[PDB]
Amino acid sequence: GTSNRDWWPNQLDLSILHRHSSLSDPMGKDFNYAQAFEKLDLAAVKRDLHALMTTSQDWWPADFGHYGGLFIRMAWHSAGTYRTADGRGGAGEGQQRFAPLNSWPDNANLDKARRLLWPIKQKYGRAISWADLLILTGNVALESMGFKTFGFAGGRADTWEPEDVYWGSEKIWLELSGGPNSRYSGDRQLENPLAAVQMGLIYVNPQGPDGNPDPVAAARDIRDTFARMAMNDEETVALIAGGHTFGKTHGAGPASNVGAEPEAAGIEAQGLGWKSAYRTGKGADAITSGLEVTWTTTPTQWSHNFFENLFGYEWELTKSPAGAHQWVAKGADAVIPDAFDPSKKHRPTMLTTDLSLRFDPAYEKISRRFHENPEQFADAFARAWFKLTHRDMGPRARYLGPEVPAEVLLWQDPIPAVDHPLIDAADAAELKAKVLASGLTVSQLVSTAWAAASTFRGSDKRGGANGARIRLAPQKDWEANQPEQLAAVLETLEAIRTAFNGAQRGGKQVSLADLIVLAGCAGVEQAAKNAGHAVTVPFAPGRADASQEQTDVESMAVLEPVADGFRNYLKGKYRVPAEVLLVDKAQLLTLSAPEMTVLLGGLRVLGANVGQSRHGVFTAREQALTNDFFVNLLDMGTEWKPTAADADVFEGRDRATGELKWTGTRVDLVFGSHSQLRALAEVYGSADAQEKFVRDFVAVWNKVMNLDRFDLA
């Protein structure tokens, strides 16, 4: 059946904004996963998981009698899709069980691992999500094998459909770089927001870059992709060596024996895939990656044998039974156990990417320290494993259950506890009046609170106004935030804060994070009053202020808005049309298409544009909250043409006289072009809509102010 995407393959796609509707969710409207999980008997789940580790199923027999390596791999891949650039991927939504991840070549035979878990998922039902269970299973694997983990938080609610993520443009699984849809350009520069070297891989190719088995050049790919997953060199070595302390790879015969991935398999496969024609197709004969490597002498027990072997032997190149490049210690005795035959032993083997940890000079220093000090290795690995598997879980306030680690980590963008009474409604009213009396304008107030709150992204639940990090490095100097205007606003607000707090009794004080938000509320209230309407914008106190020392500046860089259509801002010139970047930003802000539409048309007339640009300011009463944007955008009396100077800026002229009325960008004019967006703009641009517009504006404004407020959840 031919579809709209077939006829108009470049039209903007809005369906990303209406994923995750109540229609696709089996749970009731009022289901609260946190409440369910808080009553789980986590200890009982962990006992069942422990027993599972050594209870082999004949349809996928356990290597060495123990599923722990499989399950660590499973949990690492669940977490390993994460990209810092947009926060997408990661374990936090259990997306490994949906397309396309459930069928990525790097996730081969993890469909077996998930299926092994069904009896436990079934037993506990809605009290443990799949997302939580994949991570918990990896922790219990670790623990069962003698490794002390750093802790565990629950609270990853399940999702019910695929997320829309850009994973690349290649049309062939695993395509080597340099093709028509190459993710590389220049001197091996991977395109943002991608964090893997080939389509369908987690990070790197285990044989080496595009299959070339050079440990030195592989190290460059590891470093780059791990950095794009928020891990530095120490964390990267710890994670790779830690994980390869356990289990084995699977490459017993040629890869051509392996059949269709799950999404392509027949219905009788019942959601499994990669059925293999090689011998028994499983167990001793398993084929997963096509490598055949077993790292340590005790693959079911924590040890420091990975680095003993890596440093203790000299390595030579060889091929697995499927023909993949890997390495063997030919000088070694046969000390590595066989997974099924107690009468066989094997020499040590390593991947090309393992040898990277010894032959890249920076890695070698770290690997040597871990080798000589395996207690340092074990702490670094525990910490990095916790970070890997919680990186996309959001603020610590989301963490559930009895094993949450008490240590506060810099990467968590931590918010100090509030130890004092909060402002009440009367206090908030007094502060709103003081802000408006200071001389700060509607535009200043709205722009500042927007800048503070709109760094939130729901992909990894980082960002938002909590912390008052707008006042700190680097947010204070981001171009989108108008650093000299911002500095003057914050000085005024800080003076108001000092005066209020100095006048109080009995410990009551307001944070600057709360005041920035409250002051934006006052701006919105004043804008409505400018338009002849009395409204109260809701405000919830309880944000706290983080310090510069509690703020990782380099980690915060990926939150910088380089495109913010809601402020008509584009930091430079991108291949991606600006209207596409708008929808992407709306998706990160968790906005539907109606909410995006109302919010943008109101921000335009409140004076939120960077630089005070006139683009899209389709009103003669700027700083009044009206539906002017929509009424004037939709007026057929105005004709629109791209300017000679810039094809992405448009002039709106009176159709009869030629008189210049307005200018606008693609972000502005898409609302008059796109057939779904224009239908929305019509609702808000109708003569009966002034009350609706104001109410819907205030509701979406409040939603944005509260995106990071999981303390109130």
Add this chain to the structure above:
Amino acid sequence: GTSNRDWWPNQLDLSILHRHSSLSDPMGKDFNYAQAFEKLDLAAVKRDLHALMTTSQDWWPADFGHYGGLFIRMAWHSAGTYRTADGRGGAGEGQQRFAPLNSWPDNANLDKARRLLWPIKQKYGRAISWADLLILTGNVALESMGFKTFGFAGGRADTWEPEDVYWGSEKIWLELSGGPNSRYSGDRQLENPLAAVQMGLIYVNPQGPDGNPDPVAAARDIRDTFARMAMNDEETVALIAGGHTFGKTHGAGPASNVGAEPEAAGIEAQGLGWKSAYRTGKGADAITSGLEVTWTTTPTQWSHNFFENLFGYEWELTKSPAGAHQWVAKGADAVIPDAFDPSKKHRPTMLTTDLSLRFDPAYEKISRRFHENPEQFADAFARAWFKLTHRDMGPRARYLGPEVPAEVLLWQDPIPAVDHPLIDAADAAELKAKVLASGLTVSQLVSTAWAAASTFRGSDKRGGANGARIRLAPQKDWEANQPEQLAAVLETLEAIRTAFNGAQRGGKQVSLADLIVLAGCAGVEQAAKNAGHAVTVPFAPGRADASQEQTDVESMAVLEPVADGFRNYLKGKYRVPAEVLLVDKAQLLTLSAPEMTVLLGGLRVLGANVGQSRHGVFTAREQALTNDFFVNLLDMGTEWKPTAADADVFEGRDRATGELKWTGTRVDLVFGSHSQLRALAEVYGSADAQEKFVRDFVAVWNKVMNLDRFDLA
């Protein structure tokens, strides 16, 4: 950006079941369009529309000074996408304003018509939908030009995104027949459910079949496509000749002058398309279809001149200025007015498809009768226009406003008024007890009520249990309905009804339509009791019994389920996989994916399958309402293989013993295969879910029972 549809183009698509979520709807959850419309001042709207008719705008000047022709065309195209095979298309959702219809070649320049109506839409806002306004504007055009309409009903709520409709498989707009994706095969047999001859046409090609200007062969296409749109010969001739009493076509220069359709046009085009480089690009120079025909001597006034000209002249083949085939009157004087120059006149002209009305023998007899009896023509066209524009609106209970015609029409599938007191709760308890005492089984009761209620389709809102049409021709004889079993159930229920009604006082009686549904409720209650649960199923009385003379048997045929996965029924072999047919039926029933899931798993264990098939009856307690379907479908102890005899039937065998446990179809096993469906099935198949399953089952059962209950809405 590579998507799941790219990697797995044949995987089942569930997004169709989650269109139209509250996420995409700008109106609040509680907006009630019927209530808004009821308060509109329709008379004020109609005065505005009358004024618009001759208010010419320079960007699209009115032909002859009057937009009426353009607007009748616009309304005829809004309604003209309708197909009886599935009920999809039609005017009832205002889909003309969204892709792909807004950009179909046959809808060229209707983007201008819709834009002319923005100021009226804007003025009245939410109280008049676009869907209603398109139809209203066509009525006003008719009225304005001297034609008295049969009436008008409001009530078509707006929608906010494209419907998913199969419009064909061609990848080229307007592709002629016999291509790789041909919609024709055999002896010009058009594939169901399609009702147009080429992709992007409303019905037929105005030049003739595949462009061949043969009025006789064109007549064959007209008859077939119009019958696929629920119109017989009399209605077809009345509509074409009525419509072409007005206005003109547009073909002033070569079609190569006309630019991108709306969905492909530049952002500066602000939602319009087909910009033309020919002279002024508009008005006297307009190009729409490429034909240049004006039918009558008074194109802005109702007349009898269409049939005078059709019969009064002999016709010669000629070419328009764009090169299209059309016809000109031999020897005629220049009597037809020019649209813009009062000093020019033109000879009568006709389309190939107009000449069909004279040269097809059956049409000629009707056209002659209308020529000789123009009052008969006027009444037939009025009646047909009402039917055209209301065919997809559903029961008369949905019709709103002061111009609804009182006459009840056979095509409306009419339901007699209720003139008596309804049964109360005590009476319903008494009847349920009589039903369960009769010996009728759970399977009988559930199957009968399912058969009665599941004929509903939300595309055109036909069907459903109101009317008790299951007892009439043709529903009583449909194979899916198990005619012999059904007859024995109905006999028993009709005896219960007669006895109850005979014992009443004061006019109280129960209809058989209500009793059928109440008896199904009793079956579900009994099934719950069988499973050890205390459940009460909701029941709302007030259905009435329609007569055979109120039930057009030929129109009812299109409602026959030839595939009903809910009963594991497939009438024959289709190209389309059975699971795809299931999702299609769930969409017609207005179900989401969770609702489809719960409903099918419950129906299986209640004994709803046609023929008492054991396919998918994964329980050892048939006729008990449990979640056995899900728990047993998801048991990894069972292995599934297609049978040697039929690849679409599967055996489930104990994996260790080889013993046969179950059989299933594709409909059954898709719930264990498709990654989104299996996630749903896992919720219902978990140890904590028996209560949720029962409660969600009873809710979706009741939803299905009430689909046509617009008397309660």
